[PDB]
Amino acid sequence: KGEELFTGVVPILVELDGDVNGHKFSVSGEGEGDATYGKLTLKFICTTGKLPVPWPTLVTTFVQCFSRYPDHMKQHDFFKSAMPEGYVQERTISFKDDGNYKTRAEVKFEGDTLVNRIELKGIDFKEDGNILGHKLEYNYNSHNVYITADKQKNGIKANFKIRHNIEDGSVQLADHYQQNTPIGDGPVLLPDNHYLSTQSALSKDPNEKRDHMVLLEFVTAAGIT
């Protein structure tokens, strides 16, 4: 019955508590998602001051239940099936020739609002690296999130490579390993191998003086005919 909760516009709240190399920070996000069009619109604000890591590095961490699963692929939608009770989303983001982020998130409904609560821990980052040195461009490339079933843990696994554009024209690879498990005891949909075609656009709010990020994301499931 999870899919019925996403037929219209659903309010989203994102809350993150982070620690990267001892730099403690918090981010609060607000917006909405419309799964019918695989549309996600969110505005994030760093409530502790200046964000110690570049904004693009946190995009993937900051609600795949808003992905548009075409009608013929609806039996492969794990994300919506785990709702309203939700799911736990865990990741290990390995930045090539640099450190790593270990994230634990709980995505669930709090009333009629979809909430993403995250704890992020970043370790072994280089002081003058692409991350702590803030050498990443404020943009985002299109990617494919490859999903596979994890029948033993009653959830899914995902593997993908995020390419962050560096200011000098080079690329900072951020390899993602993901694990999602349902919070509830109800039946979930265990999918066949497929992918989520993601398109992300980053922008700024001209009237906002606080360190922020406005995200517009379009996600469509594909890979099954």
UniProtKB/Swiss-Prot annotation:
Outcome following mutation: N193S: In EBFP1.2; shifts the excitation and emission spectra to shorter wavelengths and increases quantum yields compared to BFP
This protein's UniProt keywords: Chromophore, Luminescence, Photoprotein
Reported effect, N193I: In mut2.1; shifts fluorescence lifetime from 3.03 to 2.50 ns
Tissue: Photocytes.
Outcome following mutation: N144K: Increases fluorescence at warmer temperatures such as 37 degrees Celsius. In Esmerald; leads to brighter fluorescence. In VisGreen; leads to brighter fluorescence
Result of changing K74R: In Topaz; shifts the major emission and exitation peak up to 20 nm
Effect of I166V: In EBFP1.2; shifts the excitation and emission spectra to shorter wavelengths and increases quantum yields compared to BFP
Effect caused by changing S197F: In H9; increases fluorescence at 395 nm excitation
Recorded coiled-coil stretches: none
Stored InterPro entries: GFP, GFP-related, Green_fluorescent_prot
Keyword presence, Magnesium: no
Effect noted on mutating K157Q: In R10-3; matures to the red-emitting state with excitation and emission maxima at 555 and 585 nm, respectively
Function: Energy-transfer acceptor. Its role is to transduce the blue chemiluminescence of the protein aequorin into green fluorescent light by energy transfer. Fluoresces in vivo upon receiving energy from the Ca(2+)-activated photoprotein aequorin.
Protein name: Green fluorescent protein
